[PDB]
Amino acid sequence: MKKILIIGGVAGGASAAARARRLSETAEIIMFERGEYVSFANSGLPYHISGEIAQRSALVLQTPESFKARFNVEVRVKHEVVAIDRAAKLVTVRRLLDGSEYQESYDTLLLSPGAAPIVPPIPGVDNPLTHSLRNIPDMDRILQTIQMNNVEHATVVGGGFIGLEMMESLHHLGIKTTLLELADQVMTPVDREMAGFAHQAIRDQGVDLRLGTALSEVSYQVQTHVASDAAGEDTAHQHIKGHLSLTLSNGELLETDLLIMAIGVRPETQLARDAGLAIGELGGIKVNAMMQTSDPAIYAVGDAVEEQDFVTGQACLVPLAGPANRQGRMAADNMFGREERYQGTQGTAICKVFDLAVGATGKNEKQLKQAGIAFEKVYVHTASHASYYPGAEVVSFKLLFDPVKGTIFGAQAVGKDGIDKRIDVMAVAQRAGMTVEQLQHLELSYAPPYGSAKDVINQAAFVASNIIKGDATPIHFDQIDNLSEDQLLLDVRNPGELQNGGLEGAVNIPVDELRDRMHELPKDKEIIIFSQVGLRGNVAYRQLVNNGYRARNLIGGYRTYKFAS
Amino acid sequence: MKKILIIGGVAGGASAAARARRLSETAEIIMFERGEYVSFANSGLPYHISGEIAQRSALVLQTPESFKARFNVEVRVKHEVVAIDRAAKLVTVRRLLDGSEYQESYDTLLLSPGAAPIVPPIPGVDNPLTHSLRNIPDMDRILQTIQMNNVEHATVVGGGFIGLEMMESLHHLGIKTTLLELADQVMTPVDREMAGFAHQAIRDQGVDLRLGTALSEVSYQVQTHVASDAAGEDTAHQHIKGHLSLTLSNGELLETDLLIMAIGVRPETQLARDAGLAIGELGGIKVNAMMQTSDPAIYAVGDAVEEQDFVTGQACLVPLAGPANRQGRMAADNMFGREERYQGTQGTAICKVFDLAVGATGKNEKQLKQAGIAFEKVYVHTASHASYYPGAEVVSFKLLFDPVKGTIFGAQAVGKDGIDKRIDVMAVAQRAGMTVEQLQHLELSYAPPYGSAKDVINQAAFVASNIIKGDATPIHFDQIDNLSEDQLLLDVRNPGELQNGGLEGAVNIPVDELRDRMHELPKDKEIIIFSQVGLRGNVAYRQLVNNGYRARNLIGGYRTYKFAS
Numbered sequence A, B: 001m002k003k004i005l006i007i008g009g010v011a012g013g014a015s016a017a018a019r020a021r022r023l024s025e026t027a028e029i030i031m032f033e034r035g036e037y038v039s040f041a042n043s044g045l046p047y048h049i050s051g052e053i054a055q056r057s058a059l060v061l062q063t064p065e066s067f068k069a070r071f072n073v074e075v076r077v078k079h080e081v082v083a084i085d086r087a088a089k090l091v092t093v094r095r096l097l098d099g100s101e102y103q104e105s106y107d108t109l110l111l112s113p114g115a116a117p118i119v120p121p122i123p124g125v126d127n128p129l130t131h132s133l134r135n136i137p138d139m140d141r142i143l144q145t146i147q148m149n150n151v152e153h154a155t156v157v158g159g160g161f162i163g164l165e166m167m168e169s170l171h172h173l174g175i176k177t178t179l180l181e182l183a184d185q186v187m188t189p190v191d192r193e194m195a196g197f198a199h200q201a202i203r204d205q206g207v208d209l210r211l212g213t214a215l216s217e218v219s220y221q222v223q224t225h226v227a228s229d230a231a232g233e234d235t236a237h238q239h240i241k242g243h244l245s246l247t248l249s250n251g252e253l254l255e256t257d258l259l260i261m262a263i264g265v266r267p268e269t270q271l272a273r274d275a276g277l278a279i280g281e282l283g284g285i286k287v288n289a290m291m292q293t294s295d296p297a298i299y300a301v302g303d304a305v306e307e308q309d310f311v312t313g314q315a316c317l318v319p320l321a322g323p324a325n326r327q328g329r330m331a332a333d334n335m336f337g338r339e340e341r342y343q344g345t346q347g348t349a350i351c352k353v354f355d356l357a358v359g360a361t362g363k364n365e366k367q368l369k370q371a372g373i374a375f376e377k378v379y380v381h382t383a384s385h386a387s388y389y390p391g392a393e394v395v396s397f398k399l400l401f402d403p404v405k406g407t408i409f410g411a412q413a414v415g416k417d418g419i420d421k422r423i424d425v426m427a428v429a430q431r432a433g434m435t436v437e438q439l440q441h442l443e444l445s446y447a448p449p450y451g452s453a454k455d456v457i458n459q460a461a462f463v464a465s466n467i468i469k470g471d472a473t474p475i476h477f478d479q480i481d482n483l484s485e486d487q488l489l490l491d492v493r494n495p496g497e498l499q500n501g502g503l504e505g506a507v508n509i510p511v512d513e514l515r516d517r518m519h520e521l522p523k524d525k526e527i528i529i530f531s532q533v534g535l536r537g538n539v540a541y542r543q544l545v546n547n548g549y550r551a552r553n554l555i556g557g558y559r560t561y562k563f564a565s
Ligand SMILES: Cc1cc2nc3c(=O)[nH]c(=O)nc-3n(C[C@H](O)[C@H](O)[C@H](O)COP(=O)(O)OP(=O)(O)OC[C@H]3O[C@@H](n4cnc5c(N)ncnc54)[C@H](O)[C@@H]3O)c2cc1C
Pocket: A007, A008, A009, A010, A011, A012, A013, A032, A033, A034, A035, A042, A043, A044, A045, A046, A079, A080, A081, A082, A112, A113, A114, A115, A133, A134, A135, A162, A268, A271, A301, A302, A303, A304, A319, A320, A321, A322, A324, B446, B447, B448
């Protein structure tokens, strides 16, 4: 009989306990959870706050009792592991109900303690109106402040998925909200020009979005005066729990009834550092492909561990649920001696931003330049399904690739429909090792309500392949303001379109008149073309190079350029 | 100048015309179309009938004048090519206005004449109330008979995708509909147990669905009595364009005001036969992977041609638009000497069936059985996204595979949401050569409005892999009604579920009471287990097999079983 101990009872740990039982009826399996619940839906938390998930019960998927009855796993809630004594193969456990302590032995241990919200060195940030969100109790504390302090304005710090989901929820409740992000964008897995779509959706919701802005100080002021009907004052706009006064990195003041801190999570490494387990250079527990720590009897999974990046093989931190469930499953396997290797993380993710979804997988352009990896990029703006059918929405899609070998580095997409499907297709093609040239041959579902004869993904593969083969010559949005004297900017859109915007200094020849008016264009200038989304631009470009011009086409067209600034 | 001639100005021909122009400004390009429209949305026609697509102009994507302005292609509408003289490189062309003819020389010809609806040898089939649907004038004639003959009841023959779309579209106009199909199922790309979900959806809408049944005779009866208000009669339910009396294959009479024939299409091969071009055994034009016919100067693309099945590499006929459009473009590359090879057809398809979508890629189990290829299947019935999030729907998913090599032969999926996404991911996985064991490491997008932490596809990969590894032992819906004396049937649902249907003779032990009650099961029999969807069944199976019983779990559970009859 192996005795298996599991630390943490949610995505990594609960996943390991269940698989471990299916693998062996003779193992004793004990699972410790310092909180009151196991198997709850962390991802549900922001949606219960807005009432979108109306029922609290929907957030709890198993109980200690249901884990005993189904899996004969002893789940101990309110029991926090406080030490691991490796040589003795004993853990010390604390019963949070009374503070008493006991020890328990293991043959093998799995650590899945997750990652804790990041506490920023901001004076005053510890106070009755400031909260992070990790679990059900942090959610109740948020819900309680909202009710009790009559919250009418809230501020969210941080523009990753947790902070956008909080921003969205609080907006759902009619709360006026301010989002502060220190970066120049929300959602760092996408690149800044892709984020410009979400920035405008956020601003059209009346949210006060402050990018490039840090929170420097928090001042909490207790309310000393309770207004009352009996004293004939208005009480509707009163805050009995107090007031926050925020000082920002530019000395401006923000007044707020509630502050959500959502600036990232840090792996839970204290048990593991106290036990002498190796920690990586990002601050996560270090594990081999088999998710074994520096002690071969101890395994670790999920948001506490560093993972290998699929694309680069380098270490990364990717706190998502998919990888933690599949890791917990595979450490159970390994713990019965199956030697299964985890295959690295692409960091496939997707976040709801009001009516938009913003998706990415693999590496973005900031991560590629930083590691010195040479790359090329394309943009398409193509209907989510046959345009002539109702409800079609523009998907803006970025593909990043090796301009020689055609390796896929990453893909990003933003828009109001079909985003999860395009990201999921690129995730599988990258994982399977397909090159951009091979992407051209994908054979995806087409009927008018669901797709289009040539998909979003096929169009992107043709535009990228045309670059790789020398059939297209690109210029990008960040190059096109900076033209030299042997370049002539040509706009191939129709004249009426120019009023929504265009570029300073452009000659206008509409694409469908170009073949005839082309002698107006001198052959001793490189002609720098642009259209609305890049498509008519390519047609023109082809016409020109077929006639001996030197030319470039603006990838993603004016649309990309416009959301890039 | 190369002189390029193109027969057919829609999906194959038009794609090849536009590509060919991007390839060369000097090439003379002439494209003949026997009808009045080029580049029209064939797929949109049933949708404009219903009024789902409100304006006829949405079905027309180019015009001869747009094709000449943008691409300098001379489109000749109402010109029909009536012969090819290959040895002289001349086609004979008929002007359908006049009946006059001429010749036109070519350097290279492309045939993309499509496929014609199949004409059944039924007596009486040719009459004014019976119509098939290939193009805009077909569509207009159906609309005309609808309005003129005050259609209140119609009959559709054929349960393929066009027949299904026309049934929905008629239902949508308030027209009572009967669907007749000779096979035992609608939508033959999917297996009969998957189409059972579609049968229920269609019946639920009050459509009269008759599987297994052919049309034997049609009788058209012209109307001699026009009811009038002046003679004080009810004019409301009259049909001045007459009446159809249909005789069915089992003797029954069916009376209807309109008959729609959608029994499939047949490649247009007459021109290719008269010219001596090779024709394959399925009756389509025979091409190599460069799209070239038996004459090197003559290419052929689209519905008129036989393609190469991705999975087996034998011949098939797949009349679908994505392949047509990518074949056309590659043919034009080949005409300029680029020697590109098409990579075979997976048959990826999806059809909207009322609220349901039914999709497939690859080979089905009928087709694998016919070719004598050894396979295995799994079913899963998994929420389309996190089910604690509103809107989740059940995706019923079938994976066909090689039970020893893990090769992916095909996948099928039915449900009200997320179908296009799951079939797309499978088409990508199969195309890139992943095996079922590799599917388990797919990292798909997860946020609650869009997926779940383990996607539908991961769940199906785990269940197939358990079977390959020997960790699961399947029984299927069509074996479970048998059962020898060495076998015992165990339902592991909860007692209240047995009220919604069960399997006669089951012993019921709920899985959550099974570890304590297991001694009730004798160990000298194989315990044949079922739960609702297969999931609790697997938990059970593992407990028994870990205690030294012989057992099998029913794959897809009672749900797959139920929809199989
Ligand atoms: C609001 C929110 C929304 C999210 N949305 C998504 C999403 O949409 N998509 C997605 O992929 N991911 C999302 N995530 C992330 C996903 O929840 C995590 O990546 C995943 O839960 C990590 O699993 P884990 O097992 O590593 O850690 P956790 O799920 O954090 O589980 C760790 C458990 O260990 C317990 N514990 C820690 N130390 C001890 C100890 N010493 N003794 C006993 N118990 C201990 C903790 O209390 C915790 O309950 C979201 C997270 C949050 C907070």
